[PDB]
A paper describes a structure:
Notably, although most LarAHs possess two catalytic histidine residues that are essential for the PCHT mechanism, the second histidine residue (His174 in LarALp) in a small fraction of LarAHs is substituted by other amino acids, often an asparagine which cannot function as a general acid/base in catalysis. In this study, we characterized two members of a newly identified LarA subfamily that lacks one of the catalytic histidine residues conserved in other LarAHs.
One protein that we characterized from this newly-identified LarA subfamily is a putative enzyme from a commensal human gut bacterium B. wexlerae. However, co-expression with the NPN-synthesizing enzymes in L. lactis produced only colorless protein, indicating that the purified LarABw is in the apo state because otherwise the LarAH would be yellow or brown due to the NPN cofactor. Like other LarAHs, LarABw is a two-domain protein with the putative active site located between the N- and C-terminal domains. The large RMSD of 4.2 Å for the full-length proteins can also be attributed to the different domain orientations – LarABw adopts a conformation with the active site more open to the solvent than LarALp. Most of the polar interactions are mediated by the conserved Arg434, which uses its guanidinium side chain to form hydrogen bonds with multiple backbone carbonyl oxygen atoms from the other protomer. In contrast, the interactions between the neighboring dimers are mediated by nonconserved residues with only 300-400 Å2 of surface area buried at the interface, consistent with the notion that the octamer forms through the tetramerization of the dimers. A square-shaped cavity with a side length of ~40 Å is found within the octamer with an entrance size of ~16 Å at the centers of the top and bottom tetramers.
Residue numbers in the entry:
A (entry chain E): 4 to 210, 234 to 407, 411 to 480
B (entry chain A): 4 to 211, 233 to 407, 412 to 480
C (entry chain H): 4 to 210, 234 to 407, 412 to 480
D (entry chain D): 4 to 210, 233 to 407, 412 to 480
The structure:
């Protein structure tokens, strides 16, 4: 028997004995994580030896404003020794040694279009010491992209891309960027320039691009971003820490992140891909039950396992489509689904023309600003890759399969039924089945062939 | 760290080392079940030696109408060799050896107020062989309390109890009962005369341990022939321990002699103060019991009734559940209106709602949904107050819409540790005795008692 | 038998004979109120002898604009000899003697987030003479914190608190503050710097803090506030009148307000606290039936009687929970209750994050400005009852679903609730304390005799 | 200052010194009641001294079905020694001494159109001992006008009145009645044949001579007369005399003593203004003082009571919290009735009677009457005297005065303001005022001229 995440618990599937298992922490081991007693030495050596920049003790002085940009709770570790906490601690120590007071240093959570961080979210991000040190003084701020009184206009890049920036990060003397270099389904990395281009701008600037936008910010500001990026493994444990100028550091970190993300394990090309998504993963609770977020997750899974899989791919998923449109967090997705169903739109890519219609809605913008919900444009920042490539996608165990059927996904009730239907219709009676347990509870990797 | 059921998965809790763990079967062993090989001999011996009744061959003759009453899907087994399947199979073999026509055998699924069984439910209850052999012939009928053309008003007992019983059972020449002798929170075992008194009666005969026996004996007196019971005692994993068949009235004490040994566990050394468990979404009555506020209160009241003899008077109950507000309105269409009436009336407690029971059992739309949609009868909710007077505080941990748990009188918190700290603050003190019950709603529950 | 306020009338409770009664003023007598024959002398001596400031005759002249800040109807006396009326009368006499004309003097009712005063509210606050003298010329104004063209920006204090101020009180040559020195459940007092901080600001300035904000206003204006505050007793009768600079006079008034507010009477720690809330108390009609205002009142009662009460204290309350949201006065509290019930809100504090969501609502702001309703941020300006008491019983409720949705226990009669509490929490020998008319009087903080 | 009931508490009024105060029991003393010690002797003497039938021993024998008809909770005391409890207890003692089985005794709560009594109501009516002895056996049944399987169509009287009777009372061998003889606004009395005609009849039999004719038709159809045990009550519902026997011949004797109580001679001047207040809970129950139609009923009752003491320029000033609290759980039909009054050609209340048969046949309201313990929909049509006689009716202190204005009643904010307006317009500057400060809390009496 095989155990796949099903909403909150686990669905059991009786797959043929030719099934293979890939858990990206056990099948192929990641590069060794830095031991917890060598983390201080690694951080000190990285901060004291930046790439294409002087040390923090050289760029800091008394009265020089410092803004530290910290990512939100979507990605990265939340443990007692995560990259964010240690990096902030040692950066603060360096700045205090340089002669910068605590009253000046400001912290900004860079969500961009993700919901603004609450008190509990900041507690989980910064820990227990930084939380008590800075939150009550008003020195920890969540980035608001609709606050026209805190957004500055930098003009347009050489390619005509508009650039809007946070005012707080624009008026400081020392801008510090903290990011986690981790893989993305599209092939890019969530390093320094991508983090600055995504988490500091607004929806207009989001609608090679990231490098241009971040370089435009650096030119307008007058001082380049000091980025301290850590290469994370599947358990969000730092492997290497690279600090300094983002442009000359990003390739250095990528040369090692390619070792972790791209796993050469495949010996054959598979026909059936079996997994399941729990209710709460990635963007938060309700992702595994909201149809549009399910489509995005399935598209990411298709992108990640494209090389390992054959032409007529078949994807079997175990998710609880109870129709749970998490509405305190995605207040616009019900209208999005209704517009998709009750219009002339044959496929998801036909929805893009409504993006500016949703990003400018007053009620959803108010909910984004004050209720801690997603920005209405986040649904258009994808879903179409799932529709192509795969012959059929099965959503087994759904509670309201009408929502999974309205997205174009086939619906069944048990893994064996869906597998038998796929064998009868698409993949024949001898399918190469690949089972992915805990594919959404870990940092997913791009599977490739040993060729 | 301890693990508890939470909706579908598992919520983890950090509890002090003094916490004690109880599993119904793993901690204290149930009496040994008969092995799968000896089910043959045990069933044949039980059928060949009925208690207080002649053997079924004597009861059967050519051209005799036989009605076999099979319980619902709530709690009966459903393994490969469950009691229902084996008992039905051997009864059918013996009846065929008695020369009884196959067209005179009729199966009645006795639900009473539980939803009528569909094709999949009937298949799961009866096994694929019996489902293929009998379903398409039309010989498997779910009991319908509101089918007035197929219900017979017997009259009244001596205690003013109206009696209405299925006409199919009334007109048969051999009534056979299939029953599982399993414990109840109140103490009256669920197999025997209770099965006949509850499963083939309408809500008026339920609205009114001696009551069930009186009603069933009145049924036997009116019919002229007693029910032929085939009751099996089950353990936590729904495995047979002993099989008793014959006259229900005289066989019931014999079955109880072993059901008491199974049900009443004697593992205890201290009077515990805090009871910790969790509600899965699907248990007992089906999917949605762990999120429906009324059904959550019912389950909590059952848990209070089971463990009251091991718990103190300032006890605190901490349960993990996902109070989504998911009433499962396709299966309990009356519970949303019931909840609204609870909130929007002069009702301080749940027992104040019983005066509306006759109001709900007579609703035309809910009765239609019960008959044709496979939903619960509207009077099931009124057939739940022990928790709100026995316990000092009841905590619902990890609720997704904590308004429903608060509206029923239960406190709400976010994590097990937070609720335990609050309870230690106010109710049980900083040095409590904790009893943790993982997999309490996944296994057949038992009554806990002091060792002495 | 015992009589407790129940909505509009009274519920009767057969409490055991060991029950104790505390009524403010009646049980322990307050300091003697100034006789009506000495009020003129007291006011004249206070105004002629200010603290840290000179007399109104020494600061006033011909053409110098004067703005008099007067509190709203929530607190203070509405009698024929209340502090507001007499203070305004004698201040006007002094100013007229100095040389200031009536055409210039302006009156501002400082509510802040409380509803703007209507014609009848000004009636009750000011009296016949001042009403007829000043309202019909448009010289009595109710403070509007949402009026962007009548609010000025003073920047941000040294600690990081933004300061918004009323324009009328900013452009005047002589700002005069009238406040009442009365106790608060949290420990602080009303009137003085607190009145100016919470009265003529907006919700952003409200979200030692009051001292910093008020000193920032005084620095920006250049004229310190001339505060004339009277220490009130349980019947809103003046005990002492202190005039002058607020910073150097607040301790002087506090040294005597501590004598009245802090009553050392207890001889034992009580287990059960029994009282009842009428429908109309404090913030107006519907407070005793609105679940959120009920929770606020219960929290205030918990704060006031914390020292007299045991660790396992049980509160029994008699209120008519008819679900009567005074939707013409609290248009937002139904949405607030629905958000509390239908979201991931385990407790009331978890709702604070929605404060900025409500304070910026356009419809509720319009209703606050023009309909005379509460500002939507007043609700977020609660948990103490949940943290402290083992159980809270709301007896006599009409729709107990609302009292249950707040986390409170619901019963039907005092005896049933008392028996339940005895069986569950407080045992069979509880120290019961009964508070008749605890919401119809100026409540006091009960302390221990020793 | 004067005090009046106002919702739940008391509104205070400033009235001139010429105002006269009347309290039914205190101003003029009722005839002396029998003491609590002599209740036993008086009850035994009354039971042993019938007024036209043989004693209860003669009617009783082995195997006799006895049906005892107990009035509703609307009227009559609920003290420790109320008439219902004592009469039932002594009747049961006599029947047991006569050899009547306990299983052949059945109690019927005669409500007729009032809501069916619940468990708590039955407990309060019957006393704890009798409730424990008889309720759980199933021997206490509330009358159900719409229970067609338990209703018998007796036939028709000579006036065309149709007669429908409770089947339980019809088949019994001894029908016994418990009744309280206290006055009505119309001049009748609530005990005697009226109890039979109203309590155990449906709405068709309801839509002084009529009650007697219907009850005597019932007696002639059953073959045996009702055995009545009627008690005269004072303001505090205390017994003055107990009359038992044939109702037709006993009724004048009971009336001879009820006249001395109901009619009070305390008038020396023709009063002009009548001042009182409606409490929230009185007569029919909670919500009578706030429901506009029940407020009109109460005002009409007051007008009928005090019409012989007041002039022809009547002004009625009443304090009530008319907040629109219809108590829809007890009067579910009154909101629709109010809407039909407002939104049709109804100029006055008596114009609505043509819809009475429309409401009494409603299925939803009948279901709520049978199963939810609400009023029968025809109760509201069983109200025009107030608007006919009084020149102006003032509702003082209403919280939603739209309902008081919609029924034709003037609305003001305070007692003094309404009195000033009435003096200005109707009664002049020198009126005669009669103040009733406990009119709705005590059993009302009919005021009359002293001469």
């Amino acid at each position: 028997k095989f155990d796949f995440e099903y909403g909150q618990g686990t669905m059991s599937a009786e797959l043929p004995d030719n099934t293979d298992i890939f858990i990206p922490g056990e099948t192929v081991k990641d590069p060794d994580h830095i031991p917890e007693d060598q983390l201080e030495a690694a951080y000190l050596e990285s901060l004291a030896h930046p790439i294409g920049m002087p040390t923090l003790t050289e760029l800091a002085g008394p009265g020089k404003t410092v803004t530290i940009v910290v990512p939100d709770r979507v990605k990265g570790g939340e443990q007692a020794t995560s990259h964010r906490k240690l990096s902030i601690k040692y950066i603060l120590k360096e700045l205090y040694a340089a002669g910068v007071e605590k009253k000046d240093i400001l912290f900004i959570i860079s969500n961009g279009l993700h919901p603004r961080s609450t008190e509990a979210d900041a507690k989980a991000i910064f820990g227990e010491e930084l939380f008590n040190e800075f939150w009550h003084t008003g020195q920890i701020i969540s980035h608001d992209s609709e606050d026209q009184e805190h957004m500055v206009d930098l003009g347009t890049t050489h390619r005509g891309d508009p650039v809007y920036m946070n005012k707080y990060v624009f008026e400081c003397d020392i801008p510090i960027l903290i990011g986690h270099v981790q893989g993305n389904p599209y092939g890019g990395y969530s390093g320094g320039y991508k983090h600055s281009a995504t988490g500091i701008t607004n929806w207009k600037c989001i609608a090679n691009k990231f490098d241009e936008i971040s370089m435009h910010m650096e030119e307008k500001m007058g001082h380049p971003f000091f980025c301290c990026d850590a290469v994370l493994d599947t358990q969000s444990r730092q492997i290497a820490i690279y600090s300094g100028y983002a442009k000359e550091m990003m390739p250095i970190s990528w040369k090692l992140a390619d070792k972790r993300t791209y796993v050469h394990w495949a010996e054959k090309k598979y026909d059936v891909l079996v997994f399941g998504m729990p209710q709460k993963f990635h963007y938060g609770d309700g992702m595994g039950t909201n149809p549009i977020m399910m489509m995005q997750a399935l598209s990411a899974q298709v992108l990640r396992f494209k090389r390992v899989m054959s032409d007529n791919c078949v994807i079997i998923c175990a998710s609880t489509c109870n129709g749970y449109f998490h509405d305190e967090r995605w207040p616009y997705l019900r209208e999005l689904y209704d517009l998709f169903q009750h219009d002339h739109m044959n496929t998801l890519p036909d929805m893009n023309r409504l993006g500016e219609y949703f990003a400018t809605n007053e009620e959803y913008i108010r909910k984004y600003r004050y209720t801690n919900a997603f920005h209405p444009f986040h649904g258009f920042s994808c879903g179409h890759i799932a529709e192509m490539n795969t012959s059929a996608i099965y959503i087994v165990g759904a509670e309201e399969p009408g929502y999974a059927r309205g997205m174009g996904l086939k619906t069944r009730a048990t893994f064996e039924e869906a597998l038998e239907d796929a064998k009868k219709k698409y993949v024949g009676q001898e399918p190469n089945i690949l089972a992915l347990p805990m594919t959404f509870k870990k940092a997913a990797v791009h599977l490739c062939m040993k060729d």
